[PDB]
Design an enzyme around this catalytic site. Structure first.
Site: not given
Ligand SMILES: Nc1nc2c(ncn2[C@@H]2O[C@H](COP(=O)(O)OP(=O)(O)OP(=O)(O)O)[C@@H](O)[C@H]2O)c(=O)[nH]1
Ligand SMILES: [Mg+2]
Ligand SMILES: Nc1nc2c(ncn2[C@@H]2O[C@H](COP(=O)(O)OP(=O)(O)O)[C@@H](O)[C@H]2O)c(=O)[nH]1
Ligand SMILES: Nc1nc2c(ncn2[C@@H]2O[C@H](COP(=O)(O)OP(=O)(O)O)[C@@H](O)[C@H]2O)c(=O)[nH]1
Lengths: 103, 50, 430, 48, 439, 430
Positions: E11, E71, E145, E254
């Site tokens: 995500q 998702e 994921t 590089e």
């Molecule tokens: N800097 C930043 N971090 C993000 C962003 N979106 C998600 N994260 C990071 O993603 C982590 C959690 O995972 P998610 O992106 O919410 O979901 P996922 O990694 O796809 O795994 P699932 O929750 O099982 O779907 C958080 O701790 C955030 O640090 C974003 O838009 N900007």
């Molecule tokens: Mg997700």
């Protein structure tokens, strides 16, 4: 209303003065709402489910009332938008040297 | 016994077929660079005068 | 798409379900006649989560309701939005339970459960991809506490992998209305621990305290408590129906909240709640939301959260805010209250963000917590149970329906074990 | 033009005379801007 | 002739790819529907878009990006966003159930039913590609994921393609700024998996960039959009040299011979300058000396790590704008002279410099002002082991009593595999401790 | 063009046909006076199969009304759509059978059947290319079960290669009104298995159960059962009268449903069935239709097909729809219930599609199954027959017209062999 008729300043005299109406408390003689009919569906035991008339719905709106806002928008939809991209194109360098109508 | 030499024959055939396509694909990209070169020669005399 | 079905039993379960469906209908803009008259397009993008579509364009909830006495169903049909439910999902007896666990769990519950099991089976198989089940019921009563938990066991036997939610209105000794409370409460809590994936405890006198103190009204009624529970329940699953920045589904909540398989009892809360006289006088800020949320009195349980240490917490913010302010507030509340959070787990509070707040509101916070304070409720239930069972009072009514005191002994021992290895981690240190 | 593109989306690539026929039947006011809300309502009612 | 393939999984990966492709399509002047606005282009960028876009034969262009997630919320949100006519509809792979913050779910139970499709898409992309330069992957490590599918894809690609370079921009958890509660497990297993399969690793924690935007843009309530905008700016500054003319062009190849001393040590952290608002910019100076001084400011780095606690091993800096090479050399000499930034003894030369004429591009509705010089720096330092030590400490404290283990083990995950991750990260941290020992 | 004539006897057959013809006339848009008032040319293209061309452009059914009591004819003439029947086709006796198989099959039936045989021979010869015959009657009555069966025997003797269908209403032991039903039922079954090409078992008990449970209407009458049987009767022959994706005639159904010549008893069902207050809450789709189609309690026979294994099954769909959904629902129901299908004849289900839906409905399904669970009917009928026969009760009535106990013994043996044969093909494996 502290064993009184809400025109007096026993405790909680004020915020309950803003009561909507709630007709049930002055209409618990109507009963009525005898409007389920013999549906013959929901249900049969062949006899339909016997109906007993219920009372008034009791008001509600317990949760905080709406503060006159519509909302229903998405942060992603708001953030990018086509408006900024269109504005940063087919425009610019407009200083109104002479006077001219523009959209 | 036999399946050994069979494996060598198949692998040799396939690697020859691979190297043929390798050189054939190699030449086409130099030809492509040359052909787009003249097609894009229009600019850089114009677009340079400006 | 990852839809969930609803099941309700007993008087309290039926009333809670009716109010919850009214709230969801208001949120999604579906009229009492089943015709859509909403405003924004987002109300249809996940409308299939809670409603099925029928010919003519009308949407009907996928809820199954069940009881041993037809009066509650008579009431729910005649009430507002009573035309939404399809007639096939009403299943009932003719005798009633009379607050006897054995009546609703052994003879009449068993003879009736086949039809409701068939209904839930066909409903679950009709939809495309399941996500879980949610139940709303009571444990101080007969038909709910017995037949609902029998259904719980039956459906868990058939769907081992799907997630299970229970919303149990566990009765408290302060607001007492039945003398056979300890018996059926203990039996139901015994049967729930090995099957329910997540349990959510709700307390009537706690709701009364909330209404008296925060909402500040002289004469509350079950409608208001039902509305509060409905709002909390709807806020639980906002992300599944609306877009968000950090989406979190029921499995994500379970993983983030469950340290051990038998530690699955939670206590919930909703914010913001304010009186009608002070509605306009308060700002709309994340600090205010979290300050109202973490307050112990705001919780929906008799247990005092400050008498124990939180194991895990989760918050589901709604609206358009900034993750910076949200997470910095979470950090600050975790740091200044280190005494109330168990030390051997780092960052034991989880956050989720959804883009769609409730209609007419901007920032709303649904909070769920797994802490050790729940021990006290089971402790008081146990002391009542032992003091009233040592004399074998009211025992023959149970024993006269194929029930033996051996199961009572097992249930009380199991509940005591739950208390023991639930409070062990309170004093356990790294 | 967008109506033609929408029909091309579903694959009903038609010719100009019948595209005008379809557009004009729905555009009762003859202004030339049809409302796809009424369009979708009509097709949903037909499909019912 | 030179192309790269971009992978966005998870995500967070999707929401950063949104901004990355916004900036990319804006920089070459591409309308959101994909149609070149013509507007007397006469091939102005000429051939500068094939690195990220491919002509359809008539008109529009399609990006060379693949989007993965289980998702469907983010995926169909993108499909209903503003770039709906741009991406290839079947190239945005949407799953059925979210892994829901569970590593084993996305790596042993659900992840195998999507990797085949993803490899098929990568294959059809590489077949059209002719001068493939490498892979650029974005994923969140604190998510189920994200980490699981990223590990599976890296494993599959490492054998399906082999030598092709891979650069990954991973977002490790911040010290206290954290969303989830089980993320140390996902992070530790994911870094164990990627340590020997990824070639370049870039730290992109969150709270550091929060502090950056608070201090520079004076934004007290920033959101993920600003984060993604900064990340996209860094990526474009890094990848400009492949598609734009420059004095000292530097390829992505590089990087392995300039930033990786040993095969295990391939983790680095970034910095970017100047970062200024629209009001506090137009009376300032933006000199090359001051921007390159601010770049090496420890508080200015993209990752939460104190470089003053560790030595330096390599730094690659890209300048874009009208920079002067003599000025760059003078500034480098001043940086080397000033003592606080101490380089390790065995690295007498540590700087790889690149120059590009193209000034940075600004996005409407953004926060950064229109600037005429910029620099982006990638640094390898021994101080990065602090975050690994912290993660190990958290993992040990929570694995002491086997918390949350049942959720993993019931999904097919074997209990012992946590251990080998423990010893592998212990070995890595010991390697980082060793490399800093002077001779 | 492959037309079929209609034969019916007994008050049961007369009542069934009175409403079957009404339903057919409504489907084809025919007024009670016999003048076309339809809307589409499809309703008129294929009318020659049932309706002949009479004077004035009107149409008359090719149905024969035959019975030994004329009050039934008097009543059916005054009913709705009674003017359609030509007076010639009426034939009646002035004595009555008296629930006596011997009287209805030897003395009066033999004397009267010459005229009805002449009439049916005339009608069959008049048609250009006849397709088959269909009879409708009850086996619990005297006149039908004797004289209609004798007519079946003569018809099979005279026209060898044509197809024969028989809508047989047999009495169940629960809803019984006649004391001498086992004797004449067994006699009719033994004679009818000799000549019938296809048989459709129909049970008043099953119809009453259906009306009580599905339609949920409090006061069923014979009219409602007649309506259900008329709908089922019309459903099987739709494709012969309207175009569709895959054409299928009675002979095709016979070929796909007859594994062995002695196994020609079928159990039939119709879908969908809902009450009046439940139509709004349902979605008419292929999953729901096929879920109701294989449903056990939906069947119009007392036989539970779950007690045996299906030999063959067929499905006729009405409406406009895609093909794969029928195909995959069939494959899924075959795969998921493989234990209820005998395994030495895999792919034992046929599907056919017609694009003309029934009036007032968009989708409809007709099911005809050949399964071994039917044998319990004959088992219980034989039980009652032998229990009555060991004491030679009510036997002098049958002996009074030349019949002897040899006929009873051979009929009992013949049907017992049929039951044993049905059991044999069920308890067999490759
Ligand atoms: N800097 C930043 N971090 C993000 C962003 N979106 C998600 N994260 C990071 O993603 C982590 C959690 O995972 P998610 O992106 O919410 O979901 P996922 O990694 O796809 O795994 P699932 O929750 O099982 O779907 C958080 O701790 C955030 O640090 C974003 O838009 N900007
Ligand atoms: Mg997700
Ligand atoms: N909060 C709330 N509680 C309710 C409501 N209706 C019933 N209850 C609770 O339900 C309990 C009685 O449960 P009961 O109906 O006997 O359970 P049953 O015997 O299984 O049907 C009481 O203690 C009430 O507090 C309601 O509308 N709101
Ligand atoms: N389905 C249906 N069954 C009927 C009808 N009329 C009579 N029956 C059944 O027929 C049985 C008696 O058959 P009977 O009238 O003696 O047949 P008949 O002597 O040949 O006319 C009873 O058990 C009834 O249930 C009808 O109109 N429809």
């Amino acid at each position: 209303c502290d064993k009184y008729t809400t025109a007096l300043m026993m405790g909680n005299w004020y915020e309950e003065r803003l009561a909507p109406n709630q007709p049930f408390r002055e209409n618990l003689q109507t009963k009525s709402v005898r409007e389920e009919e013999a549906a013959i569906s929901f249900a049969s035991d062949l006899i339909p489910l016997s109906r007993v008339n219920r009372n008034l719905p009791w008001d509600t709106k317990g949760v905080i009332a709406d503060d006159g806002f519509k909302e229903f928008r998405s942060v992603n939809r708001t953030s990018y938008d086509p408006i900024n991209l269109n504005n940063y194109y087919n425009l610019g360098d407009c200083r109104q040297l002479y006077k001219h109508y523009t959209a | 016994m036999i399946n050994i030499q069979r494996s060598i024959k198949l692998n040799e055939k396939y690697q020859q077929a691979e190297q043929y396509s390798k050189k054939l694909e190699g030449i086409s990209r130099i030809t492509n660079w040359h052909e787009t070169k003249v097609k894009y020669d229009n600019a850089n005399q114009n677009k340079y005068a400006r | 798409m990852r839809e969930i079905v609803h099941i309700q039993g007993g008087q309290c379960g039926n009333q809670i379900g009716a109010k919850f469906w009214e709230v969801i209908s208001d949120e999604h803009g579906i009229d009492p006649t089943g015709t859509y008259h909403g405003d924004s397009d987002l109300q249809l993008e996940r409308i299939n989560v809670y409603y099925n579509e029928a010919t003519g364009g009308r949407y009907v909830p996928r809820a199954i309701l069940m009881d041993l006495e037809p009066g509650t169903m008579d009431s729910v049909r005649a009430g507002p939005f009573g035309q939404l439910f399809r007639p096939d999902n009403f299943v009932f007896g003719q005798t009633g339970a009379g607050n006897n666990w054995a009546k609703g769990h052994y003879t009449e519950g068993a003879e009736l459960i086949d039809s409701v099991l068939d209904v839930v089976r066909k409903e679950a198989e009709g939809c495309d991809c399941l996500q879980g089940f949610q139940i709303t019921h009571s444990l101080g009563g007969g038909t709910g506490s017995g037949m609902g938990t029998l259904l719980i066991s039956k459906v868990r036997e058939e769907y081992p992998d799907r997630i299970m939610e229970t919303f149990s209105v566990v009765p408290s000794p302060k607001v007492s209305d039945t003398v056979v409370e300890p018996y059926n409460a203990t039996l139901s809590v015994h049967q729930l621990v090995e099957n329910a994936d997540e349990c959510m405890v709700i307390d009537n006198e706690a709701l009364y305290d909330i209404c008296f103190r925060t909402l500040k009204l002289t004469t509350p009624t079950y409608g208001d408590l039902n509305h509060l529970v409905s709002a909390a329940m709807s806020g639980v699953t906002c992300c599944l129906r609306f877009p968000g920045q950090l989406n979190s589904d029921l499995r994500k909540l379970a993983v983030n909240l469950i340290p051990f398989p038998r530690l699955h009892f939670f206590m919930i809360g909703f914010a913001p709640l304010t009186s009608r006289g002070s509605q306009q006088y308060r700002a709309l800020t994340v600090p205010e939301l979290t300050q109202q949320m973490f307050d112990a009195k705001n919780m929906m349980c008799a247990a005092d959260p400050r008498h124990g240490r939180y194991l895990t917490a989760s918050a589901l913010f709604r609206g358009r805010m900034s993750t910076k302010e949200v997470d910095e507030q979470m950090l600050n509340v975790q740091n200044k209250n280190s005494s109330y959070f168990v030390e051997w787990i780092p960052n034991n509070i989880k956050s989720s963000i959804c883009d769609i707040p409730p209609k007419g509101l901007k920032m709303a916070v649904t909070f769920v917590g797994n802490s050790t304070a729940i021990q006290e409720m089971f402790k008081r239930v146990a002391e009542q149970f032992t003091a009233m069972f040592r004399r074998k009072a009211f025992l023959h009514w149970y024993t006269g329906e194929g029930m033996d005191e051996m199961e009572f002994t097992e249930a009380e021992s199991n509940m005591n074990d739950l208390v023991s290895e639930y409070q062990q981690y309170q004093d356990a240190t790294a | 033009s967008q109506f033609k593109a929408a029909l091309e989306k579903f694959g009903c690539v038609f010719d100009d005379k019948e595209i005008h026929a379809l557009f004009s039947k729905f555009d009762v006011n003859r202004s030339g801007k049809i409302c796809y809300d009424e369009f979708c309502g009509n097709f949903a009612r037909l499909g019912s | 002739m030179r192309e790269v393939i971009s992978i966005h999984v998870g995500q967070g990966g999707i929401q950063v790819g949104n901004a990355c492709w916004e900036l990319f399509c804006l920089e070459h002047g591409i309308q959101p529907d994909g149609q070149m606005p013509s507007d007397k282009t006469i091939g102005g960028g000429d051939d500068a878009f094939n690195t990220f876009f491919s002509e359809t034969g008539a008109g529009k262009h399609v990006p060379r990006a693949v989007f993965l997630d289980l998702e469907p919320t983010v995926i169909d949100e993108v499909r209903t966003g503003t770039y709906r006519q741009l991406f290839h509809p079947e190239q945005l792979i949407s799953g059925k159930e979210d892994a829901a913050n569970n590593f084993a779910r996305g790596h042993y139970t659900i992840g195998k039913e999507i990797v085949d499709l993803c490899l098929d898409r990568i294959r059809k992309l590489a077949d059209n590609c002719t001068g493939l330069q490498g892979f650029l992957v974005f994923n969140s490590v604190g998510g189920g994921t994200g980490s699981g599918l990223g590990s599976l894809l890296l494993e599959r690609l490492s054998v399906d393609y082999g030598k092709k370079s891979k650069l990954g921009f991973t977002i490790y958890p911040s010290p206290q700024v954290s969303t989830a509660v089980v993320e140390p497990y996902n992070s530790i297993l994911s870094t164990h998996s990627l340590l020997e399969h990824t070639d370049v690793a870039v730290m992109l924690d969150n709270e550091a960039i929060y502090d950056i935007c608070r201090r520079n843009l004076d934004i007290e309530r920033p959101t993920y959009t600003n984060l993604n905008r900064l990340i996209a700016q860094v990526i474009s500054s890094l990848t400009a040299s492949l598609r734009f003319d420059g004095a000292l062009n530097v390829d992505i190849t590089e990087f392995q011979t300039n930033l990786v001393p040993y095969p295990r040590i391939h983790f680095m952290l970034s910095s970017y300058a100047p970062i200024i608002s629209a009001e506090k910019a137009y009376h300032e100076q933006l000199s090359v000396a001051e921007i390159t001084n601010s770049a090496f400011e420890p508080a200015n780095m993209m990752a939460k790590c104190d470089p003053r606690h560790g030595k330096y091993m390599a730094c690659s800096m890209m300048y874009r704008g009208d920079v002067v090479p003599k000025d760059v050399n003078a500034s480098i000499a001043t940086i080397k002279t000033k003592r606080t930034i101490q380089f390790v003894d065995w690295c007498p030369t540590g700087f790889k410099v690149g120059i590009n004429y193209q000034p940075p591009t600004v996005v409407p509705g953004g926060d950064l002002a229109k600037v005429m010089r910029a620099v982006c720096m990638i640094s390898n330092s021994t101080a990065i082991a602090e975050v690994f030590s912290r993660l190990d400490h958290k993992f040990d404290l929570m694995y002491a009593k086997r918390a949350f283990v049942h959720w993993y083990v019931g999904e097919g995950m074997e209990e012992g595999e946590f251990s080998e991750a423990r010893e592998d990260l212990a070995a890595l941290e010991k390697d980082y401790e060793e490399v800093g020992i002077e001779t």
